[PDB]
């Protein structure tokens, strides 16, 4: 049950920063009330995603060292992580602890919302898989944290400067792995795995986009820019 002071600080700071913003009540219950419609569901889901993107961009702005990085690189990392992050969040939301409320319902909206059942089946498989890992808020926070902090992102001019900030997070997730799940482990390798995994999922994602349609509705200008089009 190790965990140095420098680490617990970081984890405490990150876990603080992780649960601050949160999804606005309005957009949230919007899935509980209001009803179905392949076009409505698309609007709801497409609204949220636009929100999540705002939240995320705040979290990454208050992640140790972040504002210290070259301005361009900062974009890059955000442009770079936006989807994957959402995947993790998506993961976190779905599997694990059913608060017996809206979430199980969120899946219905996704199911039949102009999204081909050929993409929601493998995707919802992946999520079930990370679910097998039985993670904790901390892991999700760190995973998201380390993912936003990837030096191997298509355009960042200075990778060393990004790593410095990434390693610490990485070292905290690792030692955090032994502790919560020592039975194996490999669990820390497995996780870094899913990271490499969702990276190819960002690939199926841009494709499935150009085929998602729904009447003729459009994507919020933000998504159009962070989901390319």
């Amino acid at each position: 049950t190790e965990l140095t002071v420098d680490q617990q600080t970081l984890l405490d700071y990150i876990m603080d920063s992780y649960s601050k913003q949160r999804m606005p009540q309005e957009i949230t219950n919007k899935i509980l009330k209001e009803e179905f419609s392949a076009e409505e569901n698309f609007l709801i889901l497409t609204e949220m995603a636009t929100s999540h993107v705002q939240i995320l961009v705040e979290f990454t702005k208050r992640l140790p060292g972040f504002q210290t990085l070259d301005h361009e690189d900062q974009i890059a990392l955000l442009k770079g992580s936006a989807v994957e992050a959402m995947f993790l969040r998506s993961a976190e939301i779905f599997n694990k602890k059913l608060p017996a409320g809206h979430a199980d319902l969120l899946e219905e909206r996704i199911r039949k919302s102009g999204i081909s059942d050929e993409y929601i089946t493998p995707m919802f498989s992946f999520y079930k898989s990370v679910g097998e890992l039985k993670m904790t808020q901390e892991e999700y926070a760190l995973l998201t944290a380390i993912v936003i902090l990837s030096p191997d992102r298509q355009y960042i001019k200075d990778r060393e400067a990004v790593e410095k900030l990434q390693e610490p997070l990485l070292d905290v997730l690792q030692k955090l792995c032994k502790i919560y799940q020592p039975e194996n482990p490999q669990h820390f390798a497995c996780l870094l795995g899913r990271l490499t995994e969702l990276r190819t999922f960002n690939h199926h994602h841009a494709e499935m986009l150009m085929s998602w349609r729904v009447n003729d509705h459009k994507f919020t200008p933000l998504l159009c820019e962070i989901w390319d089009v």
Binding site: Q54, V57, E58, K61, H71, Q74, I75, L78, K79, P221, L222, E225, I226
Partner: peptide, 12 residues
């Protein structure tokens, strides 16, 4: 040009 994101980066 990622103008929307930039705007969200600097004071959201």
């Amino acid at each position: 040009e990622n103008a929307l994101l930039r705007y969200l980066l600097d004071k959201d």
